[PDB]
Structure 1
Amino acid sequence: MNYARFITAASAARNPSPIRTMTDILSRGPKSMISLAGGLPNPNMFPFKTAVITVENGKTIQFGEEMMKRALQYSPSAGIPELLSWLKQLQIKLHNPPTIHYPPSQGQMDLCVTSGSQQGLCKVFEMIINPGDNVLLDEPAYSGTLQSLHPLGCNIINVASDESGIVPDSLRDILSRWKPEDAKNPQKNTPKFLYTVPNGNNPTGNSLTSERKKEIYELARKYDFLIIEDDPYYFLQFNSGRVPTFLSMDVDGRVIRADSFSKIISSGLRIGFLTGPKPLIERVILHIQVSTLHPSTFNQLMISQLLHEWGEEGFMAHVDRVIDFYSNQKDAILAAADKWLTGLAEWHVPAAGMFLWIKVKGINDVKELIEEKAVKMGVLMLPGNAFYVDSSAPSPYLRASFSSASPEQMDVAFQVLAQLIKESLLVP
């Protein structure tokens, strides 16, 4: 594979820090080595000295004097080595990528710690997109990806979706406007990638099947496009065995996968990870190096100490307690919507995630009902407009989150909504 067509002139021009290069000779050398190279501060000047963090069902994490100096100090752009080896290990355990032992240039598996999955996704789009480029996704999509894409000046082509996510025949229909050989020609302007959330799509909650994923991968191989697998709900799947990922089937080294610890470990710590082909992961690390330098060494050390003590087993037991809480929350929003919304609205049961996508029966645009009327009543929800490329277009949909609300709060929220849905249909 040739990654050069997937990287901008700006991204290709990125160079490794000539400072880190000299600094890395220090880490590969003996204790007798003297360095006057790095601009690392003296950590003894830092005011925080020790840290003791308690863990619910787990050993208390302690940062002694030395560990604290390391945690308060600079670290590599890709991430701390202990977090990197544990995450690569996990990707192999879970997804067993075929690329593990490929040569670097051919797209060997590489991983980098990002400041949330959002940072990885952002740096990938900025790496790939030139203004006017064609890009594939299924609308409704995650707003953060729509807000990243909009300033990039690309052409978003919508791929049809149902309850089983992206319809492969819709993808086959869009792709048919180009020839498989048109991928090799830049001027023919073939799509650079396919963006998708294969588990509990934000905001629908729909998941792709194994069969659909295989049809999508064969199409990515045929029209030589990348698959941006943004999977933050891979660990939040409801009443399902884990369907293989696009990374698990990545024989070509054409999948960039974004994983998030935001729903399972911490949203505020800003720790996510990006898995993909080494030439592309490298371009992302070089952009991180000039922006954030590296993710918080402190937060990485907090997560790495927890993760290492749990094991890939203790981690999974934790994922299971998290799914349990979110299933009970989904059951509660579903009970509330059954009680108040049946006959007034339509919704599919989410497969993964923390959102219910509700279609209002007799209203074309729920924008004023949700932004004006519902707000004035003290009930907040999201209008469907926020999850489309054209936000000016009317939407009969709303997104309801079930993460934090108590059953009794959901009951009050939906009664207000049914009352507001009725006050909108009762106008003769």
Structure 2
Amino acid sequence: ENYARFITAASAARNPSPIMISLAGGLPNPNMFPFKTAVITVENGKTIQFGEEMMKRALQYSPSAGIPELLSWLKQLQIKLHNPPTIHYPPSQGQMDLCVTSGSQQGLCKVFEMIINPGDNVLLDEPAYSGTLQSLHPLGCNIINVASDESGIVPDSLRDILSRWKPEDAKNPQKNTPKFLYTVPNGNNPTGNSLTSERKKEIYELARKYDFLIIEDDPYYFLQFNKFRVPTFLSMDVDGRVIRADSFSKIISSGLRIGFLTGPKPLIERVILHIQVSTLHPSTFNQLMISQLLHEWGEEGFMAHVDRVIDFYSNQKDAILAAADKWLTGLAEWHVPAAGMFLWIKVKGINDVKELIEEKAVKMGVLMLPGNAFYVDSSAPSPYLRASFSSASPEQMDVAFQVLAQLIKESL
């Protein structure tokens, strides 16, 4: 717990800038900006108002890690939900820290870039989010698939993958033990599957034994259909080995590009220093919109909002499941998603569905997404389809599945 062995020479080289009447600053005059006030309504909520001075702040440069009121609020959220062991540690031993990012993707991308040298080994479970595979591809790592099933990563397959390395080689710089394990523990995209609490503990003990980081990409954390959320990897992180990406895109707004990253201070500080020379900071304006909403909501309002969105997505899930039962019984296999917005469907008797969907189905005015995109080798044939239930009506799902069943029959 220095973290040096985890990171690249470029990342380690990064330095903070060498930076009443102030003539020392580089702020444009915000009085020159054309936008003067703003009012944003909130459904059954307090309107967000930027008066004259607040608008000038919204339209001006702000701190790289995020605005202070949003960072304190998010720190208290993390403490209440996850009580990470790491809040009481010194900085060097991995004290809990946070930064607002321009979506959770930015956080992840910056973390991957911080850590990966050409040839490094990284573990994850395929099928995996494609934006992650596309981020990892040009970095030259070996991606090693860990087996999974309806309950996520199978600790026993991780265990036997890891048995090719020696635990004592972890801190040897000339031995290529894995740098991290990446997973989406709730509502994995594309499969819909979630990790159980017993599996998490087992995986955490492995990460400690072989001494690698866990990158917990958890954008569907607040979209769990049975409304009991099991402990996160961050909540059990006695070692300071977890970096966690949370997203507001699925519950508050995707277009505002605001997410946040939580983890060991030294690693968060590397990410912040990279952000500082790229985007500089997240939109000051969008941070304030969100900070205002959250502060006025408090616990009462936030819980109520997330309950309503969970209730919406589980009605949708019940609908797509009804439609799959009606049309696809005996033609395909699927598990009930625990969270998220996707159903993952294995078509029986066909080796690759990409012919059938990317071509035949679209003539019929319907498309779902073939599973090839979610593998490291997307050229391999895949019998799977991802179907989203975020938007389609009960009626649209029915026709969509009616059409798919037709195609599967004709193809056979």
TM tier, smaller: over 0.9
Following TM superposition, by how much is the alpha carbon of 1:289 offset from its aligned partner in structure 2, in angstroms? 0.6
The unaligned stretches of length 5 or more in structure 1 are: 19-32
Aligned length: 409
Q: Secondary structure at the match of 1:312?
A: helix
Q: Which moved more, 1:369-378 or 1:332-341?
A: 369-378
Say whether the 8 Å CA contact 1:350–1:356 is kept in structure 2. Answer: yes
How does the TM-score come out when normalised to structure 2?
Answer: 0.98
Query: 2:5 matched to 1:5?
Result: yes
Following TM superposition, by how much is the alpha carbon of 1:314 offset from its aligned partner in structure 2, in angstroms? 1.1
1:205-227: CA deviation from partner (whole Å, max 9, x where unpaired): 11111110000000011101000
1:263-310: CA deviation from partner (whole Å, max 9, x where unpaired): 100000000000000000000001111110000000000000000000
Following TM superposition, by how much is the alpha carbon of 1:238 offset from its aligned partner in structure 2, in angstroms? 1.0
Q: Secondary structure at the match of 2:192?
A: coil
Q: Secondary structure at the match of 2:229?
A: coil
Say whether the 8 Å CA contact 1:347–1:357 is kept in structure 2. Answer: yes
Following TM superposition, by how much is the alpha carbon of 1:44 offset from its aligned partner in structure 2, in angstroms? 0.5
Q: Secondary structure at the match of 1:273?
A: strand
Q: Which moved more, 1:310-319 or 1:288-297?
A: 310-319
Following TM superposition, by how much is the alpha carbon of 1:312 offset from its aligned partner in structure 2, in angstroms? 2.3
Corresponding residue for 2:149? 162
Q: Distance in 1 between matches of 2:234 and 2:380?
A: 35
Q: Secondary structure at the match of 1:323?
A: helix
Q: Distance in 2 between matches of 1:240 and 1:224?
A: 33
1:173-194: CA deviation from partner (whole Å, max 9, x where unpaired): 0111111101011222000000
Following TM superposition, by how much is the alpha carbon of 1:313 offset from its aligned partner in structure 2, in angstroms? 2.6
Following TM superposition, by how much is the alpha carbon of 1:50 offset from its aligned partner in structure 2, in angstroms? 0.4
Following TM superposition, by how much is the alpha carbon of 1:317 offset from its aligned partner in structure 2, in angstroms? 1.1
Following TM superposition, by how much is the alpha carbon of 1:373 offset from its aligned partner in structure 2, in angstroms? 1.0
1:227-253: CA deviation from partner (whole Å, max 9, x where unpaired): 000001110001151110000000000
Say whether the 8 Å CA contact 1:54–1:61 is kept in structure 2. Answer: yes
1:373-404: CA deviation from partner (whole Å, max 9, x where unpaired): 11222212111001000000000001000001
Q: Distance in 1 between matches of 2:84 and 2:344?
A: 33
Q: Distance in 1 between matches of 2:299 and 2:181?
A: 30
The unaligned stretches of length 5 or more in structure 2 are: none
Q: Distance in 1 between matches of 2:135 and 2:71?
A: 26
Corresponding residue for 1:223? 210
Q: Distance in 2 between matches of 1:75 and 1:377?
A: 51
Say whether the 8 Å CA contact 1:100–1:108 is kept in structure 2. Answer: yes
Corresponding residue for 1:252? 239
Q: Distance in 1 between matches of 2:34 and 2:369?
A: 43
Q: Distance in 2 between matches of 1:240 and 1:111?
A: 26
Q: Secondary structure at the match of 2:73?
A: helix
Say whether the 8 Å CA contact 1:346–1:358 is kept in structure 2. Answer: yes
Q: Distance in 2 between matches of 1:16 and 1:57?
A: 43
1:102-153: CA deviation from partner (whole Å, max 9, x where unpaired): 1001100000000101000000000000011000000000001000000111
Q: Distance in 1 between matches of 2:184 and 2:342?
A: 14
Q: Secondary structure at the match of 1:59?
A: coil
1:142-175: CA deviation from partner (whole Å, max 9, x where unpaired): 0010000001110000011011100001011011
Q: Secondary structure at the match of 1:99?
A: helix
Q: Distance in 2 between matches of 1:112 and 1:44?
A: 29
Say whether the 8 Å CA contact 1:90–1:312 is kept in structure 2. Answer: no
Q: Distance in 2 between matches of 1:292 and 1:191?
A: 30
Say whether the 8 Å CA contact 1:7–1:128 is kept in structure 2. Answer: yes
1:312-350: CA deviation from partner (whole Å, max 9, x where unpaired): 231111111000000000001101111111111110000
Aligned structure 1 segments of 4 or more residues deviating by more than 3 angstroms: none
Corresponding residue for 1:35? 22
After superposition, residues 417-428 of structure 1 pair within 5 angstroms as 417-424=404-411
Q: 1:105 aligns with which of 92, 95, 106?
A: 92
Q: Distance in 1 between matches of 2:157 and 2:139?
A: 25
Q: Distance in 1 between matches of 2:216 and 2:368?
A: 27
Percent pairwise identity: 100
Q: Secondary structure at the match of 1:157?
A: strand
Corresponding residue for 1:370? 357
Following TM superposition, by how much is the alpha carbon of 1:360 offset from its aligned partner in structure 2, in angstroms? 0.2
Q: Distance in 1 between matches of 2:221 and 2:96?
A: 19
Instruction: Indicate the RMSD between aligned Cα atoms, in angstroms.
Output: 0.7
Q: Distance in 1 between matches of 2:103 and 2:247?
A: 6
Q: Secondary structure at the match of 2:282?
A: coil
Q: Secondary structure at the match of 2:356?
A: helix
Q: Distance in 2 between matches of 1:410 and 1:130?
A: 44
Q: Distance in 2 between matches of 1:240 and 1:220?
A: 28
Q: 1:391 aligns with which of 375, 378, 382?
A: 378
Q: Distance in 2 between matches of 1:128 and 1:260?
A: 21
Q: Distance in 2 between matches of 1:219 and 1:412?
A: 46
Q: Secondary structure at the match of 2:46?
A: strand
Following TM superposition, by how much is the alpha carbon of 1:17 offset from its aligned partner in structure 2, in angstroms? 2.1
